[PDB]
Design a protein around this nucleic acid. Sequence first.
RNA 1: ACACCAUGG
RNA 2: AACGAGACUCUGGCAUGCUAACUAGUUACGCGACCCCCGAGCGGUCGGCGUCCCCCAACUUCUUAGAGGGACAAGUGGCGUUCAGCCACCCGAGAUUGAGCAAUAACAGGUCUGUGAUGCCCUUAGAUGUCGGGGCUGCACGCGCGCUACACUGACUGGCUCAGCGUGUGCCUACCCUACGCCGGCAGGCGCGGGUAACCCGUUGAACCCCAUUCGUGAUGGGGAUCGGGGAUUGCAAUUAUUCCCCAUGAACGAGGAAUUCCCAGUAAGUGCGGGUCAUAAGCUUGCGUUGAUUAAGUCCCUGCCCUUUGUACACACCGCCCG
RNA 3: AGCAGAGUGGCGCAGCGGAAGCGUGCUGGGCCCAUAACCCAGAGGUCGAUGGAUCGAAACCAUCCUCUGCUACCA
Lengths: 145, 266, 64, 75
Amino acid sequence: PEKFQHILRVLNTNIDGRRKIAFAITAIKGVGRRYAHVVLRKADIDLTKRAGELTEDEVERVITIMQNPRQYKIPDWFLNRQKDVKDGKYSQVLANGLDNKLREDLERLKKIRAHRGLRHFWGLRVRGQHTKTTGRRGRTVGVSK
Amino acid sequence: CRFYQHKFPEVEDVVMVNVRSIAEMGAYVSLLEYNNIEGMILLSELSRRRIRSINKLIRIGRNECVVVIRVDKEKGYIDLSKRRVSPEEAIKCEDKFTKSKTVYSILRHVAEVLEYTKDEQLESLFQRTAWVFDDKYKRPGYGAYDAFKHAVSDPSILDSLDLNEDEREVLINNINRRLTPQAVKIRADIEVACYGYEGIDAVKEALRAGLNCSTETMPIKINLIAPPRYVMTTTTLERTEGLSVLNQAMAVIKEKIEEKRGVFNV
Amino acid sequence: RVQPIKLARVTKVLGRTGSQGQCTQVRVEFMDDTSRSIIRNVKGPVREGDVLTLLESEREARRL
Amino acid sequence: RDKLNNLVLFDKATYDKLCKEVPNYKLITPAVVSERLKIRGSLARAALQELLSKGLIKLVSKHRAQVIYTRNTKG
RNA sequence: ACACCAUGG
RNA sequence: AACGAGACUCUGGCAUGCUAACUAGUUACGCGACCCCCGAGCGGUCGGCGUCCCCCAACUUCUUAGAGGGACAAGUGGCGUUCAGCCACCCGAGAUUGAGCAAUAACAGGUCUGUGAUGCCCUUAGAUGUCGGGGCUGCACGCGCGCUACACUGACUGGCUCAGCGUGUGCCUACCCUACGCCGGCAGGCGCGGGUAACCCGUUGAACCCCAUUCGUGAUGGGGAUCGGGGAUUGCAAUUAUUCCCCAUGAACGAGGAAUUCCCAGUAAGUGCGGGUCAUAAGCUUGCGUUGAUUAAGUCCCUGCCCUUUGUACACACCGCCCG
RNA sequence: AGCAGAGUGGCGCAGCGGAAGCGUGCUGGGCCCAUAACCCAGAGGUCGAUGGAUCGAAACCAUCCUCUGCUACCA
Ligand SMILES: [Mg+2]
Ligand SMILES: [Mg+2]
Ligand SMILES: [Mg+2]
Ligand SMILES: [Mg+2]
Ligand SMILES: [Mg+2]
Ligand SMILES: [Mg+2]
Ligand SMILES: [Mg+2]
Ligand SMILES: [Mg+2]
Ligand SMILES: [Mg+2]
Ligand SMILES: [Mg+2]
Ligand SMILES: [Mg+2]
Ligand SMILES: [Mg+2]
Ligand SMILES: [Mg+2]
Ligand SMILES: [Mg+2]
Ligand SMILES: [Mg+2]
Ligand SMILES: [Mg+2]
Ligand SMILES: [Mg+2]
Ligand SMILES: [Mg+2]
Ligand SMILES: [Mg+2]
Ligand SMILES: [Mg+2]
Ligand SMILES: [Mg+2]
Ligand SMILES: [Mg+2]
Ligand SMILES: [Mg+2]
Ligand SMILES: [Mg+2]
Ligand SMILES: [Mg+2]
Ligand SMILES: [Mg+2]
Ligand SMILES: [Mg+2]
Ligand SMILES: [Mg+2]
């Protein structure tokens, strides 16, 4: 049964062909599993066929939905980036847009040296956690002199 | 792949085992001189005297030689013991074990290009090679490594039996490079206190009188360690047949240096 | 180096010996010649009258 | 840990082995077919249901947790 | 029918 | 003769016997109404489902809570100097339910930071008796009580069907528990009633469990740390993110060395729900039910405790004393 | 300059080709009312350097270097 090609290289990442298509495309960053089901539902695709059982034209139908979600009627409260701080847009950053958007956000913070920027710099915990008995990476110290 | 001519070790044999788990009333240990059927050593049998912590005697991943006492040759219960070993047994087991390991790794390349889908063809080769190889030499005390030795020196038994392809290649090209110089140690233990000015020529004529019944082309390893000594490393065979080349050689030297002027050594 | 099994019936419980008081002293018959009798030391909770099983009827344990 | 290899859909050899394994077994559960063959297990379920649709096997008990079959209720 | 058990602002 | 033990007080287990109930019910029919034939019948009648509506019907089994009753080693058989009592068994709701209360003499135990209980000392207008801001949260590291996990005796998605102890509008103080309608994916918002409480939230539609679907031995859809972006509620104020919701990121961890804790029957453990603190608010603690085992009926070995005899150079009492 | 031995965890060392541990020390923890003894975890490695053989080495071969003992003691 269905012995044609399985693995597919969706943008910049190797989507394995074996897993169910829902749990197949999650190997993309910025695309969790709750977002993926919506994308596939709005793409009309069956949800009982692996990644190997999709031809070369459905996959474009899915990509264009992942990239332009606002227009395929996926509401504005699903998108991971909202009222984007620099320009007011709403969208899902996908693969390296996620890396660069985190990078730019940390740079934006450090630039005006906000209390979070310095915590990202010093490599500490940024939210309000106690730090006396947690994290605890370093090496043991001795009382001897 | 099996190590030896019997898959289940017999009673009163010393075996190489890699301890693997310290049990509650023993230890479950691998078997490494035989295939990996489990073994159980009783905790009452590690040492003859009281113990402070078991980790000081045995710990996971330590080759050790232990003696089996009883075995259910049917069900597979290898009962093992450590109180009952002398460190000599450890020697005579560990040397033959390090022999058997290289025979294991040598009889491995054949399966590289010949059929290797099954660990059983290893047994196939094993029954044709090792069984017959040791069925002979086990009467005086020798093994199949000695057979491969006698082979790569004068290849005469591998032909006398069923001959393979490229396996004699990986036989010799590995043995005679691991069967590699058995260093020679015969040097000239002679002290001379020369009394002859024409003697620099006597030493030369006696160097050319070093090894007898032989040629003027074969090289000898001269060493000038002591100016009053004349030390040679003679005809290089193996250190097994050049004996007379030390027994008789020095005599012409000492006489020809004694004949000229004054009395000399022997 | 080969001995058959033997089946004994408990006829009386004597006391609870052992260092933590774990094993139990007991007197048994032999179910083929009810004349015989030994004292044994069992590990579980014996009652009275139930059939033990001995793997070497020749021993006779005498303390803990 | 190792790599328990498994297929998600059959190859012709394995498909032959499926249509010929039916009598060989007196216990047909998804697990045993997934282990004796190199089957993912979500594939063994579908294949067993397919065979059952062919009357080739007889379902003796189905539960939410464990499913079983039998040989032919014959012989 | 007895391994080892020292010391105290 | 006195105290402690015991007796005692509360609680759990049994009454189809008593007392008596629109702030608890049940059965009946007076009913009637709805619905299906679902069975005789046809569809009514015979019946079946009703937390549908009634009764100025009958009663107290279920509910509630008062007075009494019941268990005493009382009966029967063994072991007991025939005593004090122990063991098994019968009848039984039950032959050992769980707590509270507790002596003499002490400890240089804890508390002056609970107190308008308090001696002495200190400071007393440049205050050690008030407002604004920061800290108790600061992180190379050592330890303690814990929570969630390492999956198939499982995770996810639907479906089905069961509780018990409780609290509730606040006397300054200034806030309570929530039904039902509507709006929003969600947290939440607006509107309009009940409750000072067996009366309303509420027949408290609790989770595990139960039934059916997807995944497949892969750090995987196990696990859910860390981090980006956005949306609400509390408040005078949320940054060092109070709490809450959504998309996204997806670390260690594959049953844990030497050691060591708790536990005997509705108990261990799994599982959720109320009280306390509480403007907002449990990974805590104090209680409540719910599914509900394995192993024991013992001993003095280890750590300790009580009684007698015995030894001591100890009495600040072996954590003692003391020799070169 | 020569002979012999050695070069591996901070230090002493084991390691007869299928390839990194032992004793001690250091850091931390366990046990006890404490402290030593005793128990366990962690870190620490160019196996002297350079080439070569071998399917493969720390190990075998060759050259060099560095320590130790003993004679040589040498314009
Ligand atoms: Mg002591
Ligand atoms: Mg001292
Ligand atoms: Mg002293
Ligand atoms: Mg009572
Ligand atoms: Mg009651
Ligand atoms: Mg009702
Ligand atoms: Mg009463
Ligand atoms: Mg009586
Ligand atoms: Mg009864
Ligand atoms: Mg009581
Ligand atoms: Mg008292
Ligand atoms: Mg006080
Ligand atoms: Mg005072
Ligand atoms: Mg004030
Ligand atoms: Mg202030
Ligand atoms: Mg604090
Ligand atoms: Mg505590
Ligand atoms: Mg707070
Ligand atoms: Mg609670
Ligand atoms: Mg509250
Ligand atoms: Mg609360
Ligand atoms: Mg608290
Ligand atoms: Mg007493
Ligand atoms: Mg006395
Ligand atoms: Mg006295
Ligand atoms: Mg005194
Ligand atoms: Mg003193
Ligand atoms: Mg003392």
